[PDB]
């Protein structure tokens, strides 16, 4: 699901693009303010948007949802895994775990208001 007045690609950026790494409790409010609920888990990718978008041009592989719009990053990236440890919104508190892993993104053509790449990331399908 995504906030219905946004596109999937915009929500993907909100949730997962974080080249400037942040503390989980601070960063997670940007996500949770949209839903008024504490998300249980979220991965922040510490790479620039354009480096994530470039992954969309690599070999297409099957996603968990069995679409064929997934792509494996060419390199591992730094990430932060934020996991909910206590609270109901707005008092959401998280633990953080540092990771350095490959990721698999799903991409689709942009929808109205997205930047005019051929393909934009829409889901973080998995990490490796
Ligand atoms: Cl969309
Ligand atoms: Cl997303
Ligand atoms: Cl979907
Ligand atoms: K859309
Ligand atoms: Na969907
Ligand atoms: Na929604
Ligand atoms: Na999305």
UniProtKB/Swiss-Prot annotation:
Site (Facilitates cleavage of polynucleotide substrates): 37
Residue pairs linked by disulfide bridges in the UniProt entry: 24-82, 38-92, 56-107, 63-70
Annotated tissue distribution: Highly expressed in spleen (at protein level). Has little or no expression in healthy kidneys (at protein level). Detected in interstitial leukocytes in infected kidneys (at protein level). Expressed in ureter where it localizes to urothelial and submucosal leukocytes (at protein level). Strong expression in lung and thymus, and lower expression in heart, placenta, pancreas, liver, brain and skeletal muscle. Also expressed in monocytes and neutrophils.
Outcome of mutating residue 14 to A: Strongly impairs bactericidal activity, bacterial agglutination activity and binding to bacterial lipopolysaccharide (LPS)
Enzyme nomenclature, EC number: 3.1.27.-
Predominant location: secreted
Coiled-coil ranges per UniProt: none
Its job: Ribonuclease which shows a preference for the pyrimidines uridine and cytosine. Has potent antibacterial activity against a range of Gram-positive and Gram-negative bacteria, including P.aeruginosa, A.baumanii, M.luteus, S.aureus, E.faecalis, E.faecium, S.saprophyticus and E.coli. Causes loss of bacterial membrane integrity, and also promotes agglutination of Gram-negative bacteria. Probably contributes to urinary tract sterility. Bactericidal activity is independent of RNase activity.
Assembly with partners or alone: Interacts (via N-terminus) with bacterial lipopolysaccharide (LPS).
Protein name per the record: Ribonuclease K6
Organism this protein belongs to: Homo sapiens (Human)
Organism lineage: Eukaryota, Metazoa, Chordata, Craniata, Vertebrata
Span within the parent record: 24 to 150 of 150
């Amino acid at each position: 699901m995504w906030p219905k007045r946004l596109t999937k690609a915009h929500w993907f950026e909100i949730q997962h693009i974080q080249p400037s790494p942040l503390q989980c409790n601070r960063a997670m409010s940007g996500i949770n303010n949209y839903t008024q609920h504490c998300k249980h888990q979220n991965t922040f990718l510490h790479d620039s948007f354009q480096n994530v978008a470039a992954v969309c041009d690599l070999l297409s592989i099957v996603c968990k949802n069995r679409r064929h719009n997934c792509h494996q990053s060419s390199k591992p990236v730094n990430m932060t895994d934020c996991r909910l440890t206590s609270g109901k919104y707005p008092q959401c508190r998280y633990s953080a775990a540092a990771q350095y892993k490959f990721f698999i993104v799903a991409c689709d053509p942009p929808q109205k208001s997205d930047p005019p790449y051929k393909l934009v990331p829409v889901h973080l399908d998995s990490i490796l």
